[PDB]
Design a protein around this ligand. Structure first.
Ligand SMILES: OC[C@H]1O[C@@H](O)[C@H](O)[C@@H](O)[C@@H]1O
Ligand SMILES: [Cl-]
Length: 295
């Protein structure tokens, strides 16, 4: 039982849940309203600024997907926009690129594979056993796919190296030559959680265990700001409505969380502490707080 959707069905599903999110009744000072505004900006970037210039069909656009929450939100919106642009289906699998590393969480590896099957992506993975820079990995990716003109990148202004980015932007001089398409820059952490929880799509289950940012296995811990302690003020949930009223699937689109990898549960159990899930954090400045101390 691996949930598989043909690409067209996946795109239609994402259009429907995104449209449904946009129809949520919310007050003007709410996280949900702000997320609706962020969705509309993302849609404009893709439908108005991107697709008229580069084809998402003929190989001109590839999607950089690393299984994390930002990439996942962006993929859902990208699929929604493919449906909206072309219908509102000419493609069997969507070209996707993952830069793999030897210190990636096993649960994240599993999730990338699961989601590649779920959304009928055509996954290319760089070689995790090659010692090389990201630019080098993409240079090899361009040699395999020389038709690529632009790459969709799930990154936010609050992320490291996010400050001086724009929605459409050529790569650095030491990269292969393509346009970076960066339609998620204006999203905040709270918007990410709101949309992702409402979508009722499977997400990387590490977030459920207190992780807020998935760095590498050696550095990354559950966020200490989410550690449960009788002597700390309990944390309040900002996404109760989204969870309780999350998008209802049909028979063609049913979903289930996949449990974390055994090796990751062992690492979590060894901490002898419990954490609120990642969506109890909404402060962007503390997103990467869960880290091993280094000099
Ligand atoms: O304007 C950005 C891009 O738009 C595309 O439709 C053109 O074919 C490219 O030559 C150009 O770089
Ligand atoms: Cl993350």
């Amino acid at each position: 039982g691996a949930m598989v959707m043909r690409l067209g069905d996946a795109a239609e599903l994402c259009y429907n849940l995104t449209s449904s999110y946009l129809q949520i009744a919310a007050e003007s000072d709410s996280i949900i309203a702000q997320t609706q505004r962020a969705i509309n900006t993302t849609k404009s970037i893709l439908i108005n600024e991107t697709f008229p210039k580069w084809s998402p069909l003929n190989g001109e656009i590839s999607f950089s997907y690393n299984g994390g929450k930002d990439c996942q939100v962006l993929l859902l919106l990208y699929l929604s926009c493919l449906w909206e642009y072309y219908i509102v289906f000419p493609l069997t699998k969507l070209p996707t690129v993952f830069i793999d590393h030897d210190d990636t969480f096993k649960t994240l590896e599993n999730f990338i594979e699961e989601t590649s099957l779920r959304y009928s992506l055509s996954l290319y993975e760089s070689d995790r056993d090659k010692c090389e820079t990201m630019a080098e990995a993409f240079e090899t990716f361009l040699q395999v796919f020389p038709e690529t003109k632009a790459i969709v990148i799930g990154i936010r202004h609050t992320d490291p190296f996010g400050e001086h980015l724009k929605p459409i932007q050529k790569t650095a001089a030491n990269w292969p030559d393509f346009y970076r398409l960066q339609p998620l820059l204006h999203w905040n952490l709270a918007n990410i959680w709101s949309f992702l929880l409402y979508s009722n799509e499977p997400i990387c289950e590490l977030y459920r265990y207190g992780f807020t940012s998935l760095g590498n296995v050696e550095e990354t811990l559950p966020n200490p700001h989410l550690r449960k302690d009788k002597n700390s003020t309990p944390l309040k949930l900002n996404f109760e409505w989204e969870i309780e009223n999350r998008y209802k699937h049909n028979e063609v689109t049913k979903a289930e969380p996949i449990p974390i990898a055994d090796e990751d549960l062992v690492k979590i159990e060894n901490l002898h502490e419990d954490y609120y899930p990642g969506w109890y954090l909404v402060d962007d400045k503390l997103e990467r707080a869960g880290r091993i101390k280094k000099k």
